[PDB]
Amino acid sequence: AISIKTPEDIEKMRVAGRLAAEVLEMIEPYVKPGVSTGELDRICNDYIVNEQHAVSACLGYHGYPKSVCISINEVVCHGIPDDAKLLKDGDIVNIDVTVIKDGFHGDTSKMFIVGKPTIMGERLCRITQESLYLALRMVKPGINLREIGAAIQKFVEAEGFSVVREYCGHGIGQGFHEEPQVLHYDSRETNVVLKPGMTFTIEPMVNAGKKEIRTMKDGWTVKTKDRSLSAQYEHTIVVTDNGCEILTLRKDDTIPAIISHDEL
């Protein structure tokens, strides 16, 4: 079932989350034209291991071969870091990180724009981030997860993009992927009432084009069927007594760490 974390668990999650966000703040500078995805994966790994003294949860997860997922342009998710894949001007890149510290996990990701941006690229990252923020703003005890999925979808579609169906956010803590499944669209099957103490991620994958995807020969890389661009953002949060607390907040986030719902 869904696990309610205790205050102490939360404190642990706060540490794992901060570490995860840090990695994202740390790698920004190195994200530029000409750099390979493999080198970025190496930098993150070393940082996590040697500086943070933590562990990457992705490395070996169901056989995942690298430390972080780096998805470029049309890649939807699970892009495999590789030394032959170089960053170019105009690319939109997602870097997804999961760190373990003391047994608790912190999962987060962001988009980066390489060099000069395209109108659509920049626009797609912005609506994708807005769609995550919107969801975050909704979280409070008593709401149903279905309303969140519905809201994201409606928003995204009203802006002319699509939400990927196959991939969802998830409960998280001692376990990388715990209940519940957090769908980013409306589904009559969804029925979970939020309680304080619940910890989970929200990580909408948005396509500028059609919602369909395809998985490559590699068994990991997922791409849009129509070759359109795809973007995603993700945060880890805890449901509080009157709202939520964002455990993976970074300095460039423009949403506050704690969201209090005065209507409560």
Residues found near Na ion in the complex (CB under 5 A): 71, 94, 230
Please check if 179 is assigned to a binding site. no
CA 263 distance to own-chain centroid: 28
Q: Does 37 participate in binding Co ion (rule CB under 5 A)? A: no
| Smaller CB separation from Na ion, 94 or 108 | 94
Q: Does 178 participate in binding Co ion (rule CB under 5 A)? A: no
Closest contact distance (angstroms) between CB of 78 and Co ion is: 10
The pair of three-digit structure tokens given for residue 189, joined into one six-digit string: 């099957």
Sign of CA dihedral 100, 20, 50, 31: positive
Closest contact distance (angstroms) between CB of 257 and Na ion is: 26
Please check if 96 is assigned to a binding site. yes
Q: Are 247 and 13 in contact, with CB atoms under 8 Å apart? A: yes
Please check if 203 is assigned to a binding site. yes
Q: Does 67 participate in binding Co ion (rule CB under 5 A)? A: no
Task: Please identify which residue in 41, 107, 178, 245 interacts with Co ion, judged by CB under 5 A.
Answer: 107
Please check if 83 is assigned to a binding site. no
- Strands 205-207 and 230-232, by their bridges, are antiparallel
Q: Does 91 participate in binding Co ion (rule CB under 5 A)? A: no
CA 29 distance to own-chain centroid: 20
- Strands 162-163 and 205-207, by their bridges, are antiparallel
| Smaller CB separation from Co ion, 56 or 201 | 201
Task: Residue 107: name its binding partner from Na ion, Co ion, none (Cβ under 5 to 8 Å by kind).
Answer: Co ion
Residue showing tokens 């840090």: 22
Q: Are 239 and 140 in contact, with CB atoms under 8 Å apart? A: yes
Q: Which amino acid is at 206?
A: V
- Cite the DSSP H helix spans in the chain: 7-27, 37-46, 119-138, 145-158
Closest contact distance (angstroms) between CB of 159 and Na ion is: 17
CA 85, CA 95: separation in Å to the nearest integer?
14
- By beta carbon distance, the residue nearest Na ion is 71
Please check if 130 is assigned to a binding site. no
CA 61, CA 104: separation in Å to the nearest integer?
15
Task: Please identify which residue in 9, 74, 96, 178 interacts with Co ion, judged by CB under 5 A.
Answer: 96
Q: Which stretch binds Co ion (CB under 5 A): 27-35, 116-124, 196-204, 252-260?
A: 196-204
Q: Phi then psi for 61, rounded to 5 degrees?
A: -60, 105
Closest contact distance (angstroms) between CB of 232 and Na ion is: 7
Q: Does 94 participate in binding Co ion (rule CB under 5 A)? A: no
| Smaller CB separation from Na ion, 88 or 137 | 88
Closest contact distance (angstroms) between CB of 206 and Na ion is: 9
- Strands 169-171 and 178-182, by their bridges, are antiparallel
Q: Does 199 participate in binding Co ion (rule CB under 5 A)? A: no
Residues that constitute the known binding site for substrate: 78, 177
Kindly list the residues in this chain that would bind Co ion in the complex (CB under 5 A).
Answer: 96, 107, 201
